[PDB]
Amino acid sequence: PAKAAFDSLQASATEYIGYAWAMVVVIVGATIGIKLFKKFTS
Amino acid sequence: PAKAAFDSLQASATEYIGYAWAMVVVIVGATIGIKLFKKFTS
Amino acid sequence: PAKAAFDSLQASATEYIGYAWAMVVVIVGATIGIKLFKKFTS
Amino acid sequence: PAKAAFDSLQASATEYIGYAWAMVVVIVGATIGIKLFKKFTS
Amino acid sequence: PAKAAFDSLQASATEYIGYAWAMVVVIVGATIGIKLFKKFTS
Amino acid sequence: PAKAAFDSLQASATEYIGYAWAMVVVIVGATIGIKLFKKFTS
Amino acid sequence: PAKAAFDSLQASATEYIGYAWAMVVVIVGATIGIKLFKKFTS
Amino acid sequence: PAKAAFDSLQASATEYIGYAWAMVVVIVGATIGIKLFKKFTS
Amino acid sequence: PAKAAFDSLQASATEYIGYAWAMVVVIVGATIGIKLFKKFTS
Amino acid sequence: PAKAAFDSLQASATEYIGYAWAMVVVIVGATIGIKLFKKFTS
Amino acid sequence: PAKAAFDSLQASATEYIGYAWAMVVVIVGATIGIKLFKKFTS
């Protein structure tokens, strides 16, 4: 029953992974733009 | 009879092992993509 | 709860990133103008 | 007669032992491949 | 006559003991190899 | 506290940048006038 | 301390620049008068 | 030391310039007189 | 060495200039006398 | 070589000039005599 | 070639000049005789 549960979840792992991606999109965005401002200044 | 049963199953072990592999495909997928998003951000 | 918290923050990362950008606007400004004065002199 | 019977069997022990080996080949296979999938994911 | 007979046999005990050893070589072989297959799998 | 400190300073960067500009005004002045004397001579 | 030192010097740059000008007055003088002699001749 | 050396020379430039003038006096003389002879002839 | 050479020559320019003058004496002579013959005729 | 050539010619200019003079003797002759005939008539 | 041509002509000028003279002989004749008639009358 546990193996089957893990199968259903796997897929679940894919859901989490989809979310990953967005949060890191914001973090990577940060920083790229603002460091670019710093680039201009230098 | 038990030894023979184990022979039939072995093969059974191979079936389980085939399944292994997919579930871990999802888990390894997770995480690789989303951590890549984080990489971009950094 | 922590994953959700990180979602709320992401967005938070975007806030920080917006700020980045201005501070580096000042630093990049500095220096561009004054180095231009030096350019004239040379 | 029993000692002689055991001699004939010994050899018999070798037959069993040959079989051992295959069943455990499947079990060890299982698991190595699928755990490798998990490795990729991580 | 019985004591002397036992002397002749002793030696006889040594003959049996030589045989022991081989039969148990097969049994110990069995099992070591096949359990090693299982080790790989795990 | 450090981010806020940097905000206050930015502005600070602007102060430095204002100063830049004058020092380089003198250096660029130098040289333009005197090289002009040399121009006359040639 | 170095920025302040440069401020004091700037002004220093202005001193050098004042001198420029005279040396080049002599060089430009040279040559203008004597080339004028050559002009007469031609 | 080089700037000072150039100051001493400037003046040096003035010496050269004084000489200029004489050599070109001869060249300009040449030619003015003799071309005048040609003028008479024409 | 070249400046000095030019000094020696200047003087050289004066030599050439002395010669100028004679050649043009002949050319100016020509022509003045013969055009005078033409004057008589007219 | 050209200056020397011109020297040799100058003299050459004198030759031409000698010729000038005769041709214009004829032209000036013309005209003086015949205009005198006209004078008589008037 | 033109100078030589002019030499040949000069002489040519002398030819014209010879003719001058006759035409003006007629004109000067005119007038002297007839004005003499007028003289008688007065």
Swiss-Prot record, chains A, B, C, D, E, F, G, H, I, J, K:
UniProt KW Cell division keyword = no
Q: Which residues cross the membrane?
A: 17-37
Under what name is this protein listed?
A: Capsid protein G8P
Q: Family membership, please give it.
A: Belongs to the inovirus capsid protein family.
Organism field: Enterobacteria phage fd
| UniProt-annotated location(s) | Virion; Host membrane
Q: Which residues lie on this side of the membrane: Periplasmic?
A: 1-16
Q: How does it sit in the membrane?
A: Single-pass type I membrane protein
Can you list the GO cellular component terms from the UniProt entry? helical viral capsid; host cell membrane; membrane
**Key words of the record:** Capsid protein, Helical capsid protein, Host membrane, Membrane, Signal, Transmembrane, Transmembrane helix, Virion
Q: Which residues of the full protein are shown?
A: 29 to 70 of 73
- Cite the ranges annotated as topological domain Cytoplasmic: 38-42
**What's the stated role of this polypeptide?**
Self assembles to form a helical capsid wrapping up the viral genomic DNA. The capsid displays a filamentous structure with a length of 760-1950 nm and a width of 6-8 nm. The virion assembly and budding take place at the host inner membrane.
Asked if the record carries the keyword Transmembrane helix, the reply is: yes
Outline the subunit composition: Homomultimerizes. There are several thousands of this protein in the phage capsid.
